[PDB]
Amino acid sequence: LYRIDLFITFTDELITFDYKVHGRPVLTFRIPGFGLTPAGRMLVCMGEKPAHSPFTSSKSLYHVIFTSTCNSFSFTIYKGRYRSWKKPIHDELVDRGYTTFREFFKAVRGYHADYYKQRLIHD
RNA sequence: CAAGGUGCGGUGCUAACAUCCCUAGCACCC
């Protein structure tokens, strides 16, 4: 049983992706921000490419949880942080599995591959 | 029934003991 937590922070200026293993930082990247609806933010969390909206001047956080066994792969998105009491805004379970962390991690990063290409780095 | 988050620069002392991770107070150093 492998698990990765990804926290996505949306502002109009930047969208930040923070990946964690055992809750500690392993990978981060950020891209230029754009205007989004609530629906649009969920689609970004999903790794889709939504239509842009007017700016909102808002800051919001979304919590994406990836887990896998040799039998199944789970993908869950929360508005804000996971809580015992909170319903996910999107939840997917698929009959694919992984038996090494490196391959699991490669699958996880595949969700946002196209956003990774847009990342901003130092020179 | 919606309702925790600066997700973290070191060090020392005292107190306490959130099913990803994260105890509090004071002080010194950076």
Author numbering: 5 to 127
Quote the study's own text.
The cardioviruses exhibit the highest known viral PRF efficiency in nature, with up to 85 % of ribosomes diverted into the –1 frame.
The RNA pseudoknot comprises two non-coaxially stacked stems in an unusual side-by-side arrangement, with a tilt of ∼55° between their helical axes. Stem 1 (S1) consists of three Watson-Crick G-C base pairs between highly conserved GGxG and CCC triplet motifs, providing a structural basis to the previous biochemical characterisation. Interestingly, the three guanosine nucleotides (G17, G18 and G20) comprising S1 are not consecutive, and U19 is flipped out by S1 formation. Downstream of S1, loop 1 (L1) is a single nucleotide (C21) leading into stem 2 (S2), a seven base pair A-form RNA helix (C22 – A28; U39 – G45) (**[Fig fig2]** and **movie S1**).
